[PDB]
């Protein structure tokens, strides 16, 4: 708050304007980065109330209604595991809205596959979508359909192992 110091600082010119402008550019750049990563859909997709996905369980990645933050158990675990002229500006997107964006992306990729990323969201059953993905990597649809229960069990086990691994590794 020294007037004399500011008067002497004005002898050095527009250094302070440059530093403020650079920090402002960084601060808007962080919001732009968050928009670029998470705000890639202009439609907020929602999952159906009945979670009938042909044996596939997405409870660990879908938002939990019981939590006030509306986060997934994995996202809740991730948030729990991360702990003189200076001001900290809040981010433009709050944590609940970022979680809502991830929820919309999850609902789009579960209910519509990749159709929502290229245009309107076209509904498709999740086993059929998985069969399409199997064809993408060069495996025939029959392999997915015949071993659908095994694939769903392996997927659920892997998702549970992911949650356990995140909870168990510092």
């Amino acid at each position: 708050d020294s007037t004399e110091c500011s008067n002497l600082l004005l002898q050095y010119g527009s250094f302070c304007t440059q530093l403020n402008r650079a920090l402002t550019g960084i601060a808007v750049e962080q919001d732009k980065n968050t928009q670029e990563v998470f705000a890639q859909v202009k439609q907020i997709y929602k999952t159906p109330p009945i979670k009938d996905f042909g044996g596939f369980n997405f409870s660990q990645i879908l938002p939990d209604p019981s939590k006030p933050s509306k986060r997934s158990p994995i996202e809740d675990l991730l948030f729990n595991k991360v702990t003189n002229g200076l001001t900290v500006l809040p981010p433009l997107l709050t944590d609940e809205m970022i979680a809502q964006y991830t929820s919309a992306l999850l609902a789009g990729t579960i209910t519509s596959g990749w159709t929502f990323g290229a245009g309107p969201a076209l509904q498709i059953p999740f086993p059929m979508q998985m069969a399409y993905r199997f064809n993408g990597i060069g495996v025939t649809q029959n392999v997915l359909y015949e071993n659908q229960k095994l694939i769903a069990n392996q997927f659920n086990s892997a998702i549970g192992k992911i949650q356990d691994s995140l909870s168990s590794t510092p």
Binding site: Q43, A121, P125
Partner: protein, 50 residues
Amino acid sequence: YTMSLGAENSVAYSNNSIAIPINFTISVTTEILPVSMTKTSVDCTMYICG
């Protein structure tokens, strides 16, 4: 106001229904990417000392 993330769109998911497009739109979009800057040279001796 509190910013709206987007319009709500509940996809009608069921275990035996698919949505098939009957038409298409040929969409042309623009993407602007900077490539170069203005090439500036500063004479250090002349800038500092003239």
